[PDB]
Specification:
globular; 441 residues; 5-stranded mixed beta sheet; Bifunctional cytochrome P450/NADPH--P450 reductase (chain B); alpha+beta; binds protoporphyrin IX containing FE; 12 strands; P450 heme domain; oxidoreductase; 2 chains of a larger assembly
Chain lengths: 441, 443
């Protein structure tokens, strides 16, 4: 009944607890101390961080809870607008864009994106096989190059050409700076605000240009010509730009974190890497992986799911109670009461996964049916779950599969996991050396 | 390319090779001679026995191979029906029961079964401490008493009370004779069939009775079967499949597990250093009169002992696969769609390229770090979504029971028992007997 709350800071309540560069990990440590639920108060806001499958499975009841816009999401809404990720479920443009865009993210739609995913994946592999001796790989940097280019290419046939740059594409640099500003205001300026609007313009001008410029096999085509079966309406141009902005953000950084964490856990667990590398070798018998071969990379997918278990790169989502309801039979919630699902802690729930929750064990996902309901939520929940899950997973499986096929990897620095936090998670400074297996493409 | 084939018998092809009392061990010797793969032909059937991890890791690719119903399983299907073990993956009742029953077999659901496992384990321990001096233990017999009662109690809140009997429960004798007829039917070209139907009825009537008897809510498999709804179809199991699952879980829940404990204890008394190390772990971990669930999980070496026992003698010694599509096995054995494979698990577990030269030695330390074992090298519980749903059940039960056995008794191989592996559809060390000197630790 009496809900635990972490230390307060006078009138600031718990807000300064987020005044840290690693708020998710700070929240997880708080979850370690306080348990499955703790109240988090900030000036003018109360939320509850859920960390157990017991409570989160109720929070995932869409008849009782709907997606809430966290303060993080509300600030991403400043440039993602009513894009899919920053729109409320009851906003007409969410279900509209949902129905319009869901066929473009089906498992069957991955077949159309596969070639362009390979295009970028080949560029990644070519970059690494072209490295000189003793040179190392900046993993999250290269994973972001790949995921950004993959969503750019697969999403609206735009080549960010990140592998031709060291300084990222002006869109990416503005987007990150905006996202950073979006995060800074959570734990918080006319220079910041003008820069924010300028970064908004840099993002929007690119996007808005390409909409006017444009049949490719991409998300933009479906956005330009797709009609919502419900309303019969297509997305208007302002929402299409918001979706592109949404897909550029939501399409790259969580996926690059996944690949970065996956490779980190692989090089930290050589036996797991060996299983994954040997599967990659046995399955990817062609110079270019086919869609079906990527689907055949069962273990690589398990590696990715386990990476998503330990470090879900979109580490939280927010919910609000649609009506008065009792959470877990002991925590009464009033209509509109907010919940935060602390996904990394949920994925460390000892009652679901056993005691070895901190161990990287892909075999937890041999049989996905075995995972209890709502125990594994790296892609969110219900109709507001990640529309790009199959995209992210297909890309990450394809890329990780090719990486393991073509290179032996060395944790040459004995890298100490340092998880940099934006709105997503990434192992900062994670570097490896890759010894090419000299398998041509 | 050209697949080896063992000796043939004219029109019977290789079938008379299975007309033997130890067909698995016969197949292992054949695998010893012919290697990682051999074609096995019988009238109206061709299959291929795989024995190397190299080929079995491909056979375990669920995108290429799905569980096949071996002729044994096809005959067990006569009374296990479309229960989980004898149903095809594409049968609606498989995925239904799969999704419905997986929560009842989670490692977290083992916590709910633990007390009833202890209930039976304590009965086993008290039976042995109540033996008089110089009296011996019939090991597989008592392991079957325990595993049958544990699945009976944990599965459907039914007490077979096997420790109150010398002649096993009428269900078991009917079940064994059914399995006997099912196994004997492999070599079949009216009294046998009438007896077979009667044994089915003995099983069905009891099972159906408890289903009809069961509105008490127990913490068992039967509750999940009666109230569980498949999240996919939204459907519960109907009563005809629930009866098949109980029959399935009664068969699949005890004898393979009892064989494990029987083989485990066999290898322990045959390896006193392994026994002492496991016994010392039991003493260090089982500090309470009744083992807790967490203490069982801490019996790491006991768990390694069981895995090594499952390595040498996987008590469900084979499973069958069929090629979902045309595919090439090992880059040299082209398979047509529907082509059958048998995974000869004991031979797989003797793959020198995986385990080293000492594959016949009982060395639980092989399992110190399970991560080190390559994929599909150790398959005592089958493969993929068709793997043993009760693996964690069997292992928790066996670890708990073996842990308590090692805590409470010093064991003597007083006959210097010569391993004689009885073959039904499972493996057990027939006639394996020990003496237990009680350590006089109360419960
Ligand atoms: C490993 C990679 C990814 C992870 C971990 C991830 C995670 C998530 C999570 C947790 C949510 C729910 C957020 C919330 O409820 O507030 C979400 C939603 C979303 N994601 Fe992802 N995502 C990934 C990749 C992608 C990709 C590749 C795309 C696009 C191509 C994408 C687009 C979206 C969109 C549009 C939504 C909002 C869906 C809606 O509400 O209708 N994501 N994602
Ligand atoms: C050491 C003990 C055990 C061993 C070695 C073992 C082994 C196996 C193997 C190899 C399979 C796959 C057979 C095939 O693919 O044709 C299997 C399946 C199965 N086992 Fe076990 N098992 C054991 C204990 C148990 C227990 C304790 C239960 C129930 C509580 C159980 C219930 C089942 C079921 C229902 C299946 C079929 C699963 C499915 O196809 O969905 N087994 N077992």
């Amino acid at each position: 009944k009496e809900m635990p709350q972490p230390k307060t800071f006078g009138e600031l309540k718990n807000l300064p607890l987020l005044n840290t560069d690693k708020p998710v990990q700070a929240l997880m440590k708080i979850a370690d101390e306080l348990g499955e639920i703790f109240k988090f108060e900030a000036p003018g806001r109360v939320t509850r961080y859920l960390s157990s499958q017991r409570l989160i499975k109720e929070a995932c009841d869409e008849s009782r809870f709907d997606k809430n816009l966290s303060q993080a999401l509300k600030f991403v809404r400043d440039f993602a607008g009513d894009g899919l990720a920053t729109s409320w479920t009851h906003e007409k443009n969410w279900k509209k864009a949902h129905n319009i865009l869901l066929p473009s993210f089906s498992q069957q739609a991955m077949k159309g994106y596969h070639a362009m995913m390979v295009d970028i994946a080949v560029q990644l592999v070519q970059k690494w096989e072209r490295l000189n001796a003793d040179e190392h790989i900046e993993v999250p940097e290269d994973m972001t190059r790949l995921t950004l280019d993959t969503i750019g290419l697969c999403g609206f046939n735009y080549r960010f050409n990140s592998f031709y740059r060291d300084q990222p594409h002006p869109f990416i640099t503005s987007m990150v700076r905006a996202l950073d500003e979006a995060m800074n205001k959570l734990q918080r300026y006319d220079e910041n605000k003008r820069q924010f609007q300028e970064d908004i313009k840099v993002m929007n001008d690119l996007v808005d240009k390409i909409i006017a410029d444009r049949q490719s096999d991409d998300l933009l085509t479906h956005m330009l010509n797709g009609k919502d079966p419900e309303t019969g309406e297509p997305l208007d141009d302002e929402n299409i730009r918001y979706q592109i902005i949404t897909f550029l953000i939501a399409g790259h950084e969580t996926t690059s974190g996944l690949l970065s964490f996956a490779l980190y856990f692989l090089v930290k667990n050589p036996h797991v890497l060996q299983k994954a590398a040997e599967e990659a070798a046995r399955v990817l018998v062609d110079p270019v992986p086919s869609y079906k071969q990527v689907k055949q990379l069962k273990y690589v997918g398990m590696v990715l799911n386990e990476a998503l278990r330990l470090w879900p790169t979109a580490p939280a989502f927010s919910l609000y109670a649609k009506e008065d309801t009792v959470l877990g039979g002991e925590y009464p919630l009033e209509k509109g009461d907010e919940l935060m699902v602390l996904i990394p802690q949920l994925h460390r729930d000892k009652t679901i996964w056993g005691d070895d929750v901190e161990e990287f064990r892909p075999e937890r996902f041999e049989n996905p049916s075995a995972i209890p309901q709502h125990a594994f939520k790296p892609f969110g929940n219900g109709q507001r779950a990640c529309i790009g899950q199959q995209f992210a997973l297909h890309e990450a499986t394809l890329v990780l599969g090719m990486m393991l096929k073509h290179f032996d990897f060395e944790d040459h620095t004995n890298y100490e996991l340092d998880i940099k936090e934006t709105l997503t998670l990434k192992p900062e400074g994670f570097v490896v050396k890759a010894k090419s297996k000299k398998i041509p493409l």
